[PDB]
Amino acid sequence: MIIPVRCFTCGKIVGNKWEAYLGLLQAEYTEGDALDALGLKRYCCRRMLLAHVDLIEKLLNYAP
Amino acid sequence: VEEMRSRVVLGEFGVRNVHTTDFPGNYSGYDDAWDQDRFEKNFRVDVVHMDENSLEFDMVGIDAAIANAFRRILLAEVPTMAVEKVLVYNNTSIVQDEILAHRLGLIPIHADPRLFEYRNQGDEEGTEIDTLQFRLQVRCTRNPHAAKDSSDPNELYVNHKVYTRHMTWIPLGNQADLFPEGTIRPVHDDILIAQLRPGQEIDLLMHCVKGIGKDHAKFSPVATASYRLLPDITLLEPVEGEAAEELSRCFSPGVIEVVARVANPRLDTFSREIFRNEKLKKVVRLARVRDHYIFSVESTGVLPPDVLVSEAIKVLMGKCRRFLDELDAV
Amino acid sequence: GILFEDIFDVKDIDPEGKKFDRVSRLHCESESFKMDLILDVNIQIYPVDLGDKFRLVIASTLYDRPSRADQFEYVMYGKVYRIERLSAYVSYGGLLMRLQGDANNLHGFEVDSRVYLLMKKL
Amino acid sequence: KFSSRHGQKGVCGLIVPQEDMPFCDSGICPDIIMNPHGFPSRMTVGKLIELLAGKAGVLDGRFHYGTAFGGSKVKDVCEDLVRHGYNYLGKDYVTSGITGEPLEAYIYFGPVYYQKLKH
Amino acid sequence: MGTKANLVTPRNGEPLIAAIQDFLTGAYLLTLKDTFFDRAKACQIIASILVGKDEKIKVRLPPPTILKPVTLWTGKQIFSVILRPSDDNPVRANLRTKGKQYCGKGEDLCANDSYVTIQNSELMSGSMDKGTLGSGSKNNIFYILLRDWGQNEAADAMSRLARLAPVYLSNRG
Amino acid sequence: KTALEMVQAAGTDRHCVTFVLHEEDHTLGNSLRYMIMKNPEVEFCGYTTTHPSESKINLRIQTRGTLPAVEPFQRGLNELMNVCQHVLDKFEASIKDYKDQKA
Numbered sequence: 001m002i003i004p005v006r007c008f009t010c011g012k013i014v015g016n017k018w019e020a021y022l023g024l025l026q027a028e029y030t031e032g033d034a035l036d037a038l039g040l041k042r043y044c045c046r047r048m049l050l051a052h053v054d055l056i057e058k059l060l061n062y063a064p
Numbered sequence: 065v066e067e068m069r070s071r072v073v074l075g076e077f078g079v080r081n082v083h084t085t086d087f088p089g090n091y092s093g094y095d096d097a098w099d100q101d102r103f104e105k106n107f108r109v110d111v112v113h114m115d116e117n118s119l120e121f122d123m124v125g126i127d128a129a130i131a132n133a134f135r136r137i138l139l140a141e142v143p144t145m146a147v148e149k150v151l152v153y154n155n156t157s158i159v160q161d162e163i164l165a166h167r168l169g170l171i172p173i174h175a176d177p178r179l180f181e182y183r184n185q186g187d188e189e190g191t192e193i194d195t196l197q198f199r200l201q202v203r204c205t206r207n208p209h210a211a212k213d214s215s216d217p218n219e220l221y222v223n224h225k226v227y228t229r230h231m232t233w234i235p236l237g238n239q240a241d242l243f244p245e246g247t248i249r250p251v252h253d254d255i256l257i258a259q260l261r262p263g264q265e266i267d268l269l270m271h272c273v274k275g276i277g278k279d280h281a282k283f284s285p286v287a288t289a290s291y292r293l294l295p296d297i298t299l300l301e302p303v304e305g306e307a308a309e310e311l312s313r314c315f316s317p318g319v320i321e322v323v324a325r326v327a328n329p330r331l332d333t334f335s336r337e338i339f340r341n342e343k344l345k346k347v348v349r350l351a352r353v354r355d356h357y358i359f360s361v362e363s364t365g366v367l368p369p370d371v372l373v374s375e376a377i378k379v380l381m382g383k384c385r386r387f388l389d390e391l392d393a394v
Numbered sequence: 395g396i397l398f399e400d401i402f403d404v405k406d407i408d409p410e411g412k413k414f415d416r417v418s419r420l421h422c423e424s425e426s427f428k429m430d431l432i433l434d435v436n437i438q439i440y441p442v443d444l445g446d447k448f449r450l451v452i453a454s455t456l457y458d459r460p461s462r463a464d465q466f467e468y469v470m471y472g473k474v475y476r477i478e479r480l481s482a483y484v485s486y487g488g489l490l491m492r493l494q495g496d497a498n499n500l501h502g503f504e505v506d507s508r509v510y511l512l513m514k515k516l
Numbered sequence: 517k518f519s520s521r522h523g524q525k526g527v528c529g530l531i532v533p534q535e536d537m538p539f540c541d542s543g544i545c546p547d548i549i550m551n552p553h554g555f556p557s558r559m560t561v562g563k564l565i566e567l568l569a570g571k572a573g574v575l576d577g578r579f580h581y582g583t584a585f586g587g588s589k590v591k592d593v594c595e596d597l598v599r600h601g602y603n604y605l606g607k608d609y610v611t612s613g614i615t616g617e618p619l620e621a622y623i624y625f626g627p628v629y630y631q632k633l634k635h
Numbered sequence: 636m637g638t639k640a641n642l643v644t645p646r647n648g649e650p651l652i653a654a655i656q657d658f659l660t661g662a663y664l665l666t667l668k669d670t671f672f673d674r675a676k677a678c679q680i681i682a683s684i685l686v687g688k689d690e691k692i693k694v695r696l697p698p699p700t701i702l703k704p705v706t707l708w709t710g711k712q713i714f715s716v717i718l719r720p721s722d723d724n725p726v727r728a729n730l731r732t733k734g735k736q737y738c739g740k741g742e743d744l745c746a747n748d749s750y751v752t753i754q755n756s757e758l759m760s761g762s763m764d765k766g767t768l769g770s771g772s773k774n775n776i777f778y779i780l781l782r783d784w785g786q787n788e789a790a791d792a793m794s795r796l797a798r799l800a801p802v803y804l805s806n807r808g
Numbered sequence: 809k810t811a812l813e814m815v816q817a818a819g820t821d822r823h824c825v826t827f828v829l830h831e832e833d834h835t836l837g838n839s840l841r842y843m844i845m846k847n848p849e850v851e852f853c854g855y856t857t858t859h860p861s862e863s864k865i866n867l868r869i870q871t872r873g874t875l876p877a878v879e880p881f882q883r884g885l886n887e888l889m890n891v892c893q894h895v896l897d898k899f900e901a902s903i904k905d906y907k908d909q910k911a
């Protein structure tokens with residue numbers, strides 16, 4: 001669906017790091033060091049951006 | 065003969081000394097029976113690296129039982145304000161109602177607690193001394209100067225994304241004590257709440273309450289409030305002659321100096337790579353000091369982390385004065 | 395109050411290979427009494443090595459207020475639980491002791507009775 | 517009922533608070549403490565590599581292929597934890613949440629794909 | 636049809652209600668020869684067994700088995716608190732048996748230490764296998780506590796271990 | 809009605825009581841257990857949560873002599889409150905020194 005605004009394990013505010021993350025992947029930035037630019041140190045808050053799929057831009061198409 | 069009840073020692077298969085083991089009549093010769101002025105002298109707090117939304121102070125000289133209070137108290141017993149009841153009006157978003165109302169819950173709120181009080185009864189109306197209302201009115205259309213492209217910032221973007229900037233503050237009552245950015249909606253103004261397509265609305269009031277973190281984790285004032293004992297690494301044998309730079313890449317990078325000197329042990333993450341070497345694993349015992357830990361508080365942003373810790377100690381003291389006045393009744 | 399004492403020479407630090415990280419089972423021999431004993435010793439607190447003369451005293455009682463028998467430097471506490479040249483099996487929680495041989499000097503022992511060790515290096 | 521992408525399904529027996537749970541050094545308290553007795557009788561060693569291939573995966577910003585009869589081997593995943601300062605088997609030193617003292621043994625630790633299912 | 640009555644299956648006479656999985660690997664790791672608890676951890680593991688018909692007993696920690704250089708308990712001495720927590724408890728359990736990975740030679744004195752000897756509900760030697768705690772063996776303690784000392788003491792000592800052994804294992808990891 | 813004592817026997821024994829502290833958990837128990845175990849006249853202290861469903865711990869104190877199972881408990885809190893008074897002041901004196909050094 002949409003990005004969950006917390007990490008599930010720690011609860012770092014991670015919902016505000018999606019379009020800032022997608023803005024990084026639009027540039028040259030590799031999948032790895034894009035999350036090091038956003039200040040995601042531990043891996044549990046790193047999987048909330050890495051393993052996330054964004055269905056909400058795809059569902060919107062079928063929702064006039 | 066020599067007593068390391070003061071270092072946990074990390075083997076290759078287990079962690080050896082672990083429990084505190086320093087109480088009256090455990091270690092003969094040693095009187096350890098809580099001399100108050102002995103604790104008062106051997107204890108200090110060394111603060112390292114406090115910017116906004118972090119803190120890495122030390123607290124050298126307490127047992128790991130009281131230290132596990134301050135980690136735990138920070139995690140789930142320091143109160144904060146968060147959205148609890150989302151009074152929903154017309155909401156035609158594709159995001160479901162509760163999942164919207166749950167995602168409004170996890171947004172942190174910069175209004176500090178201990179200005180407010182708890183919610184006594186059910187009391188769904190609020191009393192402007194308990195609550196803090198927010199409004200969210202987003203209705204997106206097409207902009208008229210949109211080009212023929214399918215770029216969602218360009219076309220269809222009157223308010224395609226409901227950020228937390230769109231939340232505003234309905235001062236409930238006098239609310240003149242707090243200033244204009246005083247209740248800065250969500251501490252982070254970039255949090256994406258939901259997405260919309262033109263013709264869709266989100267209209268909802270919110271209610272914020274003062275909640276313990278153990279009631280629900282959206283009230284948690286801190287991202288992580290963990291701690292870790294300061295490691296100290298002792299080379300039993302002098303290491304030199306290219307085995308030093310072998311031992312350099314074995315540890316964490318900043319920890320070591322090159323002969324081999326253990327320059328700065330505090331930066332060591334416990335990879336435990338020595339035991340893969342089969343030669344240096346007999347050379348150096350790795351250990352962590354028991355009464356010297358490293359706290360690492362990183363707030364979400366409700367209260368600054370130097371006021372989270374001084375509130376965390378303040379409610380443990382209040383938890384024991386709550387019980388000491390029970391014995392005074394009885 | 396002493397049940398039994400002599401000087402012992404530990405000969406095999408662990409006879410069948412190290413099985414535990416904190417307890418190694420010693421094999422010793424007495425001085426002129428020839429009492430074999432098979433004693434487990436917590437070696438993290440009290441490390442022992444091969445060929446080390448050490449005293450050993452078995453006492454029913456130790457007599458901080460009554461000023462205990464503390465000239466020795468390793469004291470356990472356990473009960474005798476089997477008497478099988480007599481063997482005399484003592485258990486110290488889990489740490490076994492199989493003091494053996496020449497039943498005339500073993501006379502102080504019984505079954506189901508509390509027994510202290512008081513060891514000391516030399 | 518949760519399953520675990522290896523047929524080791526399990527009803528969620530207890531829901532502890534977060535502060536009662538064995539955080540590691542970097543702060544990560546777990547989500548789903550799994551019992552280690554599901555392993556030595558079922559012999560699902562493929563689960564034990566997902567906690568390794570996942571944990572090296574998130575730390576590098578990469579999705580590790582574990583396919584059938586191939587995929588990312590352990591001898592190259594394990595030397596990716598070392599670059600990020602982790603144990604080369606994944607067993608991370610935790611300290612217990614309840615008592616505050618460190619745990620006597622290291623604890624395996626990582627992200628594995630838990631799918632909730634319709635029971 | 637109570638559980639305190641049907642502890643024993645009618646095919647063999649074996650007990651079916653006994654420890655499973657973690658409790659067995661909890662109590663084996665506790666009664667293993669290497670563990671030593673100080674009065675810090677010893678009164679913490681023991682005081683887990685004080686809720687629910689057990690909160691009204693003066694729980695007697697046994698005197699420690701090391702005194703002089705550091706004083707600390709052993710693991711098996713804390714497992715004896717399961718069989719006899721109070722002072723006025725009338726249970727005296729007795730059991731002598733082989734175990735898994737048996738040493739083959741030597742009765743109880745070999746370093747492998749797989750030979751259980753309980754005297755008067757005090758674990759004197761050996762470690763608690765499945766065959767001394769689990770289901771299917773006619774010489775586990777919960778079967779021995781059943782026949783010799785009624786069935787209330789077997790169900791109590793089984794409901795003591797289920798409370799005690801995870802509290803050790805979750806702090807031993 | 810938070811703390812409540814549990815008499816060992818109908819006759820009444822003051823050498824061993826069982827404090828039931830309502831609405832709490834290891835956050836206090838494990839920090840009060842430590843500060844009451846450092847008393848030289850307590851032979852047994854320990855706590856247990858009755859159940860994760862309810863919220864209470866069962867501290868049990870057993871002294872040596874004739875300690876009324878309440879005087880270490882009323883000194884377990886008083887030593888802990890004197891700690892949390894001191895560790896707070898050493899904290900706030902150190903943040904105030906760290907911030908000024910950054911200026």
Ligand SMILES: [Zn+2]
Nearest residue numbers: 007010011045
């Ligand atoms: Zn996290």
